[PDB]
Design a protein around this ligand. Structure first.
Ligand code: NAD
Ligand code: NAD
Ligand code: NAD
Ligand code: NAD
Lengths: 258, 258, 258, 258
């Protein structure tokens, strides 16, 4: 029925692990055929090896236009079509705002904001040229809704993703192309493992005291899983969401309400 | 599946027509057994007659605590259980702010805000007594996000639904109970058909010109249908939305982005 | 100066004590002549007596249209004019959401939401009749932006003030009338003193531990004063805010950012 | 008065013309001594000649750390102090989203986001080294709140300013440093004059049809002047705004309500 993705062809950037790998598995379960584009091709291959409908693994660096152009064309050729882009790749570093370096400012913006711009822009050109009712889902963040201390540069780059998402949605809507983002909470991935260590170091706490504090900040009372985000991305990709565009959907267990 | 409602027991207030009827039908199609509570029990039984998984129709006036309490108990008894509430009943009148009467202020607040309060409160008491991981979806409005001219009292009452939703969601979260709302845009039902002719008069326009304006204000390029909303209500009821609570989900065709 | 209110005629509802009393004193200091309409006229008379520019105290119950109509006319007649309304009167009770009584629901909505509706509606009728560049500032709350546990009914009533404010602002803007609201944080008045007791009992804490928690939740690191709110109300009344209408200005010391 | 800026030492980036020059003039009128830092140092000298309290003109390119560091030190030395930064420099280009170039992507982010980051970060270092209760006001945009078609890249960069502002505010509040931003609507400057010609060409309209459309979207019913923004910046800089930080204050004439 209306949540079904049978026959559709999807690309997921940053799909080798964490949230992106969960997105790839959820799209596949819902009936899609999935290409994963990532820095880490061998992990991408291992995810694909477990998919029902097959799929494809390609190397990409989302910071570079020429890499995104080539990886997307390669994926599209392999898939035999293109209906859906999940632009999920992202990074962070943690620093007091007064100490943020230009190198880490650029690192955060070029993956998180420019990475989404390039994948989205190139996807829309392909949708328009094939006359496809394409769909996009971007992975933003809680930090796209509320600026986070020690992550002031990461917050700025995730606000940028959400603004991009809204403006692109307005331009794409008369073409019947939808564009939304999800804003996850405290998701237990390798990113969380890093950030609890960084926060613990900066605050003079233990890493597990820091992870306990995340849970205590979450009304639903548990740490978030990649799968909590992935099932929402499937909804946003599907015809159940046909009258929804330019949204930043919170998946945070009650931390943020919009 | 994670989008399905197989075996769930649901109550829909205001389920006899328009958005609420489409909600009852969507819940049923997803696998739920549905009780409809409405002022118009004959129209309610008519919707129930076409459902796949059975169902039940009961009389209710959502403005009155004794009525809500008796209807809810009767519906639960008939269902053999209770997992889901969709509090959808609602009304409007259009009028210049300077001319709003106390009678129409009360009409809007008593059905829209008080009606959601009473059905939500009594539902939560039932969920808690049974240790049920209960779910609520309230029908709010685009007018809960942006104040609308000629609907100042209507806007206030819908903002109230949204405020109630967030606060209740914060209290119910540690009890494993979720509470969200949907904010529909311009929906083709008898509320719209009423509204458009009266809006035209007040604005010194023709009714086809007013309708045409709603279309051009919608990025996705069409009038909204009750099914556009009902499918989003199914997702919010389902385990795919298990990590989402206290939200106001826009279903407006891109008119509003949050 | 563009912040000067010299020669202007103001009505403050709820101006007898706390925030309202601070608002009346700040408007007066900025050059206005101020009438205070309050349920406690003895206290209102004491505030008015100490004002630099004259003024008038009148008894009002903002829950009742006949009271608001009569008190507003009496104040306007005494002032010899009418330029500015600050509708500040408000109440609260605290209760778990599943225990909220109909009486306390009505108590909160009739004062907070209806009281603002009546005062604003009647003010606009006066402004329009005399071709006045009128201004309204409403006192909403932090709980108009974020649902507060134990204050679910209070939250819904304050969300309603904010929704009313936006819709009325859209209708009045073509007529040279502005309408905004302020959203205060944890302000040290009699309301706070009552609430910290109720909250301590409900949460099993001490009253001062509850107050300490408010402070720890506030980035600027101190409890709020009525004067912190009053000076922003002066701004919103003034010609410096001439291009601002329909806003909810947060005054919370960084607790909420919009 | 609480709106007085007597004795305070202010730096304005992008103060040579438009909104920035209006800000510089308004701060000086309020009692501040003003240094203007701009790409056009001859235009900054023109503005300083009309200030009551004297002032200083210094060349800066806000895209380059070395330039910002040097200009700010020069300004602070000239002023004999440093209490207030208004980071106002900004640029735009217009383009359909599918045609946006990497060059103009970089142009928008480097001035608008990075320019604010650099001036803000360096200012906080100086405030902290001197134990100063510093204040910052950033010039964001309506496009920091709503994604704008043809300005998708410009929107993203301005959302970035707003997120940066929130996160920095959270870090700076315990040090008694305030950080807010303003979000102007359709302001009559050379940027507007440029944008109406570009927009008219991309849409197949006249420039005066485009202008008329901005006005008809504005509830106050007129095009905005730079002074409508500058007087709000004076408020945000002053002790009247002492309990306000991390906000995006709309100055749009009712276009956007938050
Ligand atoms: N974990 C959280 O709490 C959390 C919260 C909110 C948002 N997010 C966001 O969700 C997304 C996924 O994060 P995650 O937690 O799963 O992190 P992760 O580090 O586990 O996964 C990141 C993936 O993106 C890929 N990647 C990184 N840079 C790339 C580049 N230049 N080109 C191509 N691929 C690249 C990595 O190889 C990896 O497969 C990111 O956009 C992140 O900002 C995470
Ligand atoms: N249609 C729109 O344009 C639109 C837009 C935004 C929000 N909404 C909201 O969506 C919901 C449904 O709107 P609709 O257009 O389908 O309206 P409708 O009038 O077609 O149906 C409303 C249903 O609520 C019931 N109802 C009314 N008062 C009741 C009471 N006191 N007790 C029990 N039942 C009562 C009616 O009998 C009816 O079945 C409402 O909450 C409405 O405010 C509608
Ligand atoms: N104290 C806080 O922490 C806080 C926070 C957010 C919002 N507020 C809001 O600020 C406003 C003032 O609160 P306060 O703390 O100064 O409270 P308070 O209890 O000290 O004063 C309320 C004032 O309103 C008047 N009032 C009450 N009912 C009235 C009626 N029916 N008619 C006319 N006057 C009536 C009272 O006589 C009193 O003068 C209220 O609207 C309140 O909801 C307070
Ligand atoms: N005009 C509007 O309608 C509008 C609306 C929203 C936001 N804004 C924002 O307001 C601010 C000013 O806009 P304006 O309309 O006055 O524009 P403008 O083009 O008139 O002036 C911009 C000023 O910034 C300076 N500048 C540009 N690049 C610089 C650099 N690299 N280093 C130092 N100085 C530089 C210019 O020399 C100029 O003095 C910008 O941040 C803009 O994005 C304007």
């Amino acid at each position: 029925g209306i949540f079904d993705l049978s026959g559709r062809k999807a690309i997921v950037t940053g799909g080798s692990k964490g949230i992106g790998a969960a997105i790839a598995r959820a799209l596949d379960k819902a009936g899609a055929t999935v290409a994963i584009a990532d820095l880490d091709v061998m992990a991408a291959q291992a995810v694909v090896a477990g998919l029902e409908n097959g799929g494809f693994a390609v190397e990409v660096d989302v910071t570079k236009r020429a890499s995104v152009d080539a990886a997307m064309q390669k994926a599209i050729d392999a898939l035999g079509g293109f209906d859906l882009l999940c632009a999920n790749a992202g990074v962070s570093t943690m620093r007091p705002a007064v100490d943020i370096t230009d190198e880490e400012w650029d690192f955060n913006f070029d993956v998180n904001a420019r990475g989404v711009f390039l994948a989205n822009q190139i996807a829309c050109r392909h949708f328009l040229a094939s006359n496809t009712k394409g769909v996009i889902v971007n992975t933003a963040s809680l930090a796209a809704k509320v600026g986070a201390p020690l992550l002031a540069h990461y917050s700025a780059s995730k606000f940028a993703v959400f603004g991009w998402t809204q403006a692109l949605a307005r331009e794409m809507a008369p073409k019947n192309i939808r564009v939304n983002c999800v804003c996850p909470g405290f998701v237990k991935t390798a990113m969380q493992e890093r950030e609890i260590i960084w926060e613990a170091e900066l605050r003079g706490m233990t890493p597990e005291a820091v992870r306990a504090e995340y849970v205590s900040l979450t009304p639903l009372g548990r740490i978030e899983e990649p799968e909590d985000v992935a099932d929402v991305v499937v909804f946003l990709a599907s015809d159940a969401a046909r009258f929804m565009t330019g949204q930043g959907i919170n998946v945070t267990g009650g931390v943020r309400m919009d």
